[PDB]
RNA sequence: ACAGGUGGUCAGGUAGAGAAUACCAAGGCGCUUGAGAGAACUCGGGUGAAGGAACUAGGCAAAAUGGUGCCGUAACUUCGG
RNA sequence: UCCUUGUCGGGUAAGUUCCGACCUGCACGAAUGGCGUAAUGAUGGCCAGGCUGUCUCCACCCGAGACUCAGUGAAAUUGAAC
RNA sequence: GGCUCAUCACAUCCUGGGGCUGAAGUAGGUCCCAAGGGUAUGGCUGUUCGCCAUUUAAAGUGGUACGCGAGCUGGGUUUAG
RNA sequence: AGUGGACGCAUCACUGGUGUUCGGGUUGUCAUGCCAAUGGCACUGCCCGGUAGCUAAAUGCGGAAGAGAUAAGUGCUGAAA
């Protein structure tokens, strides 16, 4: 009964949730900012933020593991090259949540989840 | 006699020389500072009001802060009281330590058990489950009948049916003690106590034989 | 019986009644067999009847159970007389006498 | 208390008509029994009489026996004194079981 | 199951007593630009905490 | 936190570390009357659960044509001497598949190191 | 963890090989059998030249349990194949002259140490 | 703007005995309401210690075997099985 | 047609169902066909072996509803109801 | 009729307190008070009931329109073949 | 005094179950250009385990003792008489 449990459901199966966070994390790092629902952004921090942590140290073994996630060569190429050096001095807190009210189609709480640096 | 208020920490076991494994629950009991004493003259019953723990002064409200300042004692996480045993006396501002449990050998433990939400009837009173086959349709764990045909015309009060578990006071009687930790402020009791980790508990000497 | 050593209760009670078999009921119900009454007797008893009667059996050791009276045996309801030509059985068989 | 209790029972059971006694060393073979001593009785009454005697004296001997086996039957009865085990038997049923390599 | 009698405006009215909406009464003023917004929500012009948000 | 410091006092720091799938020799205490002696148990470990003071491991052996398994506690006073006879070479943590096939056809090669 | 209508093995030379217990004892609504218990059995497979015959109903005592026992120090003794020893119906003396397979020490507390005297393994 | 019915032609690759099957080529779609925690309960399922039909009218449902080559294959028979 | 389900055997520890038989049984009944019949049958009944949440005793988990929010928006029934 | 769910009265099955006894003790038999709790598992048949097998303290008697299908079951009864 | 069955409560420390969010093995296929390494699908593709949480089969506790008025019954003193 959710006692001491983590990980939401999102009305999607386990495979769909993995694909959900795979595409969303790649979208955030590529465009440096994405707009998504409030719980999805919160749960994305459990996926996108650890990616930079593996990208803090550049190595072939870490890059291959980082390639296994986000299933994209462009995304991993950006990591270990530009996110690494900029986030090297920061331990955690790689992204912040900026809520922007509700949608006009279904009354869904949106939030601007973006990287804290945001290119200065 | 009086009891103490502690915090549940976890469950472990104690290994003995003769080879007896006894499960033990770790209870963190701190210095219990009494806040005010009631007597027969004031309200008609003997009770000593005690608090434990520490609370940040930011959200300690003025009525709570003023009450604590009246006794000269610091803030506490929660406030409780205990009944006297007709012949012992205590003074306001005195801190109650843990060594009094070194001779009881039996302690009653009370607290709020884990909340299990709106549980089913098959879970709340171990209702027997109907057959999941042999034509059974849309009824596998439902209670089924709840009354009699037109003679009572209603369902009796106190019927055992689907409800909500937990978030209620639960008492376990005559829980054996293992050791009393005074220099570290721990209470060791054999068995399992109600409630989860971090939940406040009330421990009193056992009233039964 | 070991504990009993006389027939004192037998002067007290000269009649022993076994449980009569329950009558048949509706819904094809069969009555329960009457409970067998067991009589506690001191060891070494001999029992004699009338009408050129003789002994039934000598008791030498405890634990021997002797069959003295056979109860009557149950009758038959109308259902057992099921048939096509009759098609309405009003006949029943009386129980055998004890 | 190994040989002390062993000598404490063999002499006293002999005083109560203890016939055909065998002293067996089982050390290294079983981890539950230390010494197997065998006693024989004439019939049911004899084996029961010695069985009650050995447990009656054990109560006054300090050590408490850990159990008995003979109930409403004298075919096999065996009682314990802790480290040492004593088997009191009769002639007929002994040969039915196996002897002296238990 | 179906009803056996017709409920009235009185029966309908009390059941709707808890259907009334609640005013937010939680409008905040930005310390830099000065537009009304909700707690912890960026303004319609893209302003929050007085720091220059994307403002798109 | 305060619970964590309790185990270290009750822990013993003399238990050797062994791989799952090794032949282990254990001398287990037994209580009877007033004599408290050792009992020898020969077998191969098929599971390791090293969690706190209650770290456990399962020892399985075959006696008289049937398989018998026993669980233990590393930090319990019941066990006194624990030794490793043959170091097995299996690349799996839990060895629960030994129950299916016979032991005579399920010999484990040495680690060779 | 032996219940009503449970198929068990036989751990003595009485003559039975495959057995099926039919009635567990101990009280009303007796659910399951532990390690030292009196359980009633029915013989399903036995050697025709043995001491017993197929179809006989009598009492027996379990010696090995698939679920295992509970040592008072957080230990269990599991087994592969539940087994029983033949005992008479009127008297609680066992029938088999020899016992096959180990027997746990927990049978001492249940007061059937005679079985423990046999079965030299453990 | 219905989870139904409607005849013909074209018949790609991979393993396969194949027009079954799993992925996939060209091609077409995500099924005109969605966002939230995953309560009882309902539906489709997955797993399970000990026992294995003891539930039930009934092995109902479930669970289980399932392919190729080789050896062997009973009673009976119309000599085909 | 009945008595002690007819009672002996298999099947089961225990079998109002099943299988050849004892008898106190003969009505049907020989193209409104009788007897036996290999193979065949989503055919009636019974038993056995493996198998399992069918069950003792249910527990957990994966999804769609059930719940809240936003949008659209029925139903059978109703003499009146505090 | 079975499953889930129970409730009430005591003309009490056990446990509890007694009287009498032709009650030496255990074991018994009858009667009185007492409803707080408990009051079975399987084969047969659709079964209620009953027989049998095996336990315990027993496997209680009746009302509940011989309780309970806007809870389940369709095995009997069961229109149409 | 000890130990048992059912019942209820509490916890996951032990022993297990689940644990499609953790790791690994493996079959077919597609893709990342390719070797290697990965990801998608095939019930979680099929299995081996397994973190917390939940849970029982797992482990602790309880049915009180006692106080007042009592039923049946047993009584003390004592008149109507």
Whole-angstrom Cα distance, residue C47 to residue C42?
Answer: 12
Question: Which residue's entry shows tokens 């009992």?
Answer: F39
How is residue G75 written in tokens?
Answer: 């230990």
Contact B16, B24 (CB under 8 A): no
Angle, in degrees to the nearest 10, between helices A48-56 and A60-68: 170
Distance C86 CA to H65 C1' (A): 54
The radius of gyration of chain G's CA atoms, rounded to the nearest angstrom, is 13
Bridge partners of B170?
Answer: B111
Whole-angstrom Cα distance, residue F90 to residue A76?
Answer: 37
A3 touches chain B (CB under 8 A): yes
Chain F nearest C-alpha distance from G59 (Å): 24
B16 touches chain F (CB under 8 A): yes
Q: Encode chain E in three state secondary structure.
A: CCCCCCCCHHHHHHHCHHHCCCCCCCCEECCCCCCEECCCECCCCCEECCEECCCC
Contact A98, A110 (CB under 8 A): no
State whether residue F27 is helix, strand or coil. strand
Output the DSSP codes for G87-120: B-SSS--B--SSB-S---GGGGTTT-HHHHHS-S
Q: Please tell me what DSSP assigns to residue G15.
A: S
Cβ contacts of G98 on chain D, cutoff 8 Å: 98
Report which of D89, D92, D94 is spatially closest to residue D19, judged by C-alpha positions: D89
Neighbours of chain C (3+ CB pairs under 8 A): none
Q: Residue G34 to residues B156, F30, F60, G2: CA-CA distances in angstroms? A: 41, 21, 21, 7
Give the angle subtended at the CA of F72 by the CAs of F67 and F73, to the nearest 5°.
170
State whether residue F43 is helix, strand or coil. strand
Whole-angstrom Cα distance, residue D96 to residue D3?
Answer: 30
- Among the partner-chain residues D29, D71, D75, the one whose CB lies closest to the CB of G120 is D29
- Domain of E46, in residue numbers: 1-56
C40 is near strand J: CB distance < 7 Å: yes
Whole-angstrom Cα distance, residue G23 to residue D53?
Answer: 37
Whole-angstrom Cα distance, residue G85 to residue G90?
Answer: 15
Whole-angstrom Cα distance, residue G114 to residue G118?
Answer: 7
What count of CB pairs under 8 Å joins A to E? 15
How is residue B59 written in tokens?
Answer: 């959200």
Nearest-nucleotide field for A2 (CA, C1'):
K53
Bridge partners of B106?
Answer: B176
Q: What are phi and psi of A77, to 5 degrees?
A: -60, -40
Contact G93 D73 (CB under 8 A): yes
Contact F76 G105 (CB under 8 A): no
Contact G101 F66 (CB under 8 A): yes
- Chain B residues with CB within 8 Å of chain G CB: 13, 15, 19-21
Q: Which long-range contacts (CB under 8 A, 24 or more apart) does D71-78 make?
A: D71/G91, D71/G92, D72/G91, D73/G91, D73/G92, D73/G93, D74/D43, D74/D44, D74/D45, D74/D47, D74/D48, D75/G91, D75/G93, D76/G93, D76/G114, D77/D47, D77/D48, D77/D51, D78/G113, D78/G114, D78/G117
Cβ contacts of D32 on chain G, cutoff 8 Å: 105, 108, 116, 122
Q: Residue G52 to residues B148, C78, D98, G47, G88: CA-CA distances in angstroms? A: 55, 47, 19, 8, 11
Bridge partners of B181?
Answer: B186
Residue G44 has a CB neighbour count (10 Å cut-off) of 13
Q: What are the start-end ranges of the E strands in chain A?
A: 33-37, 95-102, 109-115
Report which of G104, D81, D85 is spatially closest to residue F33, judged by C-alpha positions: D81
Nearest-nucleotide field for B111 (CA, C1'):
K10
Report which of C49, C44, C48 is spatially closest to residue C64, judged by C-alpha positions: C44
State whether residue A15 is helix, strand or coil. helix
Question: Which residue's entry shows tokens 């009656």?
Answer: D56
Q: Which long-range contacts (CB under 8 A, 24 or more apart) does A71-77 make?
A: A71/A22, A71/A26, A72/A26, A74/A30, A75/A25, A75/A26, A75/A29, A75/A30
Q: Encode C12-35 in three state secondary structure.
A: HCCCCCCCCCCCCECCCECCCCCC
Contact B200, B111 (CB under 8 A): yes
| Closest CA in chain D for residue F41 | D31
Whole-angstrom Cα distance, residue F22 to residue F95?
Answer: 10
How is residue D79 written in tokens?
Answer: 């009682």
Q: Residue G47 to residues F19, G14, G51, G85, G98: CA-CA distances in angstroms? A: 46, 10, 9, 16, 16
Q: Please tell me what DSSP assigns to residue F110.
A: B
Question: Which residue's entry shows tokens 């399903």?
Answer: G44
Residue B24 neighbours by CB under 8 Å, 6+ apart = B11, B12, B13, B14, B178, B188, B189, B190
Bridge partners of F43?
Answer: F24
Q: Residue D62 to residues D5, D53, D58, E4: CA-CA distances in angstroms? A: 12, 15, 6, 85
- Domain of F43, in residue numbers: 1-113
- Among the partner-chain residues B12, B16, B21, the one whose CB lies closest to the CB of F6 is B12
Report which of F86, F88, F85 is spatially closest to residue F111, judged by C-alpha positions: F88
Residue C41 has a CB neighbour count (10 Å cut-off) of 15
Whole-angstrom Cα distance, residue B171 to residue B127?
Answer: 23
Whole-angstrom Cα distance, residue E36 to residue E30?
Answer: 7
Distance C97 CA to I66 C1' (A): 68
For the CA atoms of D66, D72, D74, D77, the dihedral, rounded to the nearest 10 degrees, stands at -10
Whole-angstrom Cα distance, residue B139 to residue A100?
Answer: 46
Q: Residue C63 to residues C1, C43, C59, C66, E19: CA-CA distances in angstroms? A: 8, 10, 9, 10, 83
How is residue D4 written in tokens?
Answer: 């002390």
Cβ contacts of B117 on chain A, cutoff 8 Å: 1
Bridge partners of B176?
Answer: B106
Instruction: Characterise G74 by phi-psi region: left (phi > 0), alpha (psi -120 to 50), beta (else).
Output: left
Residue C52 neighbours by CB under 8 Å, 6+ apart = none
Residue A31 neighbours by CB under 8 Å, 6+ apart = none
- Domain of G90, in residue numbers: 1-122
Output the DSSP codes for chain B: ---EEEEEEEEEEEE-TT--EEEEEEEEE--EEEEEEE-TTTTSS-EEEEEES---TTT--HHHHHHHHHHT----SEEEEEE--SS----TTPEE-SGGGGTT-EEEEEEEPPP-BS--HHHHS-PPPPPSSTT--S-SS-----S-SSSS-S--TT---S--BSSSEEEEEEEEEEEEETTTTEEEEES--SS-TT-EEEEEE----
Whole-angstrom Cα distance, residue G75 to residue F75?
Answer: 13
Chain D nearest C-alpha distance from F97 (Å): 31
Q: Please tell me what DSSP assigns to residue D44.
A: H
Whole-angstrom Cα distance, residue B92 to residue B42?
Answer: 15
Whole-angstrom Cα distance, residue G82 to residue G98?
Answer: 17
Report which of D48, D78, D82 is spatially closest to residue D62, judged by C-alpha positions: D82
How is residue G49 written in tokens?
Answer: 């030249």
Residues 51-70 of C with CB under 7 A from strand J: none
Contact A98 E42 (CB under 8 A): yes
Report which of G115, G121, G117 is spatially closest to residue G37, judged by C-alpha positions: G115
Contact F15, F57 (CB under 8 A): no
Cβ contacts of B116 on chain A, cutoff 8 Å: 1
Contact F109, F89 (CB under 8 A): yes
Contact A40, A24 (CB under 8 A): yes
Chain B nearest C-alpha distance from F100 (Å): 32
Chain D nearest C-alpha distance from F26 (Å): 14
- H/E stretch holding F29 reads strand F23-32
Residue G117 has a CB neighbour count (10 Å cut-off) of 21
Domain segments of chain D: what residues? 1-102
What's the distance, CA F88 to chain centroid?
13
How is residue F6 written in tokens?
Answer: 């309790």
Question: Which residue's entry shows tokens 């048939």?
Answer: C83
Question: Which residue's entry shows tokens 């456990």?
Answer: F56
Cβ contacts of F37 on chain D, cutoff 8 Å: 31
Bridge partners of F26?
Answer: F41, F82
Residue A43 neighbours by CB under 8 Å, 6+ apart = A7, A8, A10, A21
Whole-angstrom Cα distance, residue B118 to residue B116?
Answer: 7
């Amino acid at each position: 009964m959710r006692h001491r449990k983590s990980g939401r459901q999102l009305n999607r199966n386990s495979s769909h949730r993995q694909a959900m966070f795979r595409n969303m994390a790649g979208s955030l790092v590529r465009h440096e900012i994405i707009k998504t629902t409030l719980p999805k952004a919160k749960e994305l921090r459990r996926v996108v933020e650890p990616l930079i942590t593996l990208a803090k140290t550049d190595s072939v073994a870490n890059r291959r593991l980082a390639f296994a996630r986000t299933r994209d060569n462009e995304i991993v190429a950006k990591l270990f090259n530009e996110l690494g050096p900029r986030f090297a001095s920061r331990a955690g807190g790689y992204t912040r949540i900026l809520k922007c009210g509700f949608r006009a189609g279904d009354n869904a709480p949106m939030a601007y989840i973006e990287l804290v640096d945001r290119s200065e | 006699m009086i009891g103490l208020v502690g915090k549940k920490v976890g469950m472990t076991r104690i290994f003995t020389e003769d080879g007896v494994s006894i499960p033990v629950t770790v209870i963190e009991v701190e210095a219990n500072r009494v806040t005010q004493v009631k007597d027969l003259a004031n309200d008609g019953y003997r009770a000593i009001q005690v608090t434990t723990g520490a609370k940040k002064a930011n959200r300690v409200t003025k009525p709570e802060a003023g009450h604590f300042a009246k006794a000269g004692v610091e803030a506490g996480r929660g406030l409780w009281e205990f009944r006297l045993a007709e012949g012992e006396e205590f003074t306001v501002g005195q801190s109650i330590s843990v060594e009094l449990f070194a001779d009881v050998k039996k302690v009653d433990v009370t607290g709020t058990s884990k909340g299990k939400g709106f549980a089913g009837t098959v879970k709340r009173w171990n209702f027997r489950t109907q057959d999941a086959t042999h034509g059974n349709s849309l009824s596998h764990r439902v209670p089924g009948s709840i009354g009699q045909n037109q003679t009572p015309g209603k369902v009796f009060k106190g019927k055992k049916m689907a409800g909500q578990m937990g978030n209620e006071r639960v008492t376990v009687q005559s829980l054996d003690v293992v050791r009393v930790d005074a220099e570290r402020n721990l209470l060791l009791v054999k068995g399992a106590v109600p409630g989860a980790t971090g939940s406040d508990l009330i421990v009193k000497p056992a009233v039964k034989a | 019986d070991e504990n009993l050593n006389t027939l004192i209760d037998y002067r007290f009670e000269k009649s022993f009644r076994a449980e009569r078999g329950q009558n048949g009921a509706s819904r094809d119900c069969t009555g329960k067999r009457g409970k067998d009454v067991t009589i506690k007797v001191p060891v070494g008893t001999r029992v004699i009847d009338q009408g050129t009667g003789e002994t039934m059996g000598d008791m030498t050791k405890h634990g021997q159970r002797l069959l003295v009276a056979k109860g009557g045996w149950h009758g038959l309801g109308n259902t057992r007389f099921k048939s096509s030509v009759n098609r309405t059985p009003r006949q029943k068989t009386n129980g055998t006498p004890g | 208390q190994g040989k002390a209790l062993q000598d404490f029972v063999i002499d006293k059971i002999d005083d109560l008509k203890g016939q055909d006694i065998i002293a067996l060393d089982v050390q290294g073979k079983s981890s539950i029994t230390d010494c197997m001593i065998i006693c024989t009785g004439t019939s049911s009454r004899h084996v029961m009489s010695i069985a009650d005697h050995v447990v009656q004296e054990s109560r006054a001997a300090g050590l408490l026996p850990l159990g008995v086996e003979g109930e409403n039957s004298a075919d096999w009865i065996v009682v314990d004194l802790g480290d040492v085990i004593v088997h009191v038997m009769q002639e007929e049923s002994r040969r039915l079981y196996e002897l002296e390599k238990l | 199951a179906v009803q056996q009698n017709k409920p009235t405006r009185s029966k309908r009215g009390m059941r709707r007593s808890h259907d009334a909406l609640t005013a937010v009464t939680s409008l905040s003023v930005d310390k830099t630009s000065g537009e009304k917004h909700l707690r912890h929500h960026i303004t319609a012009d893209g302003y929050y905490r007085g720091r220059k948000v994307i403002a798109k | 936190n305060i619970i964590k410091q309790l185990e270290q006092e009750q822990m013993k720091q003399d238990v050797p570390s062994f791989r799952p799938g090794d032949t282990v020799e254990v001398k287990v205490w037994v209580v009877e009357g007033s004599k408290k002696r050792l009992q020898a148990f020969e077998g191969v470990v098929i599971a390791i659960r090293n969690r706190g003071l209650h770290s456990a491991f399962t020892v399985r052996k075959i006696s008289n044509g049937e398989g018998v398994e026993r669980v233990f506690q590393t930090h319990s006073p019941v066990v006194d001497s624990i030794s490793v006879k043959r170091r097995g070479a299996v690349r799996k943590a839990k060895l629960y598949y030994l129950r299916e096939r016979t032991g005579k056809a399920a010999r484990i090669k040495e680690r060779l190191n | 963890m032996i219940q009503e209508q449970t198929m068990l093995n036989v751990a003595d030379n009485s003559g039975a090989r495959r057995v099926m217990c039919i009635k567990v004892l101990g009280g009303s609504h007796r659910r399951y059998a532990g390690v030292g218990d009196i359980i009633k059995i029915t013989i399903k497979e036995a050697i025709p030249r043995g001491k017993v015959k197929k179809g006989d109903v009598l009492k027996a005592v379990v010696v090995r349990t698939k679920k295992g026992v509970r040592r008072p120090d957080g230990s269990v003794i599991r087994f592969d194949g539940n087994a029983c020893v033949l005992l008479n119906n009127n008297s609680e003396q066992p029938i088999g002259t020899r016992i096959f397979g180990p027997v746990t020490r927990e049978l001492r507390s249940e007061k059937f140490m005679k079985i423990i005297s046999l079965a030299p393994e453990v």
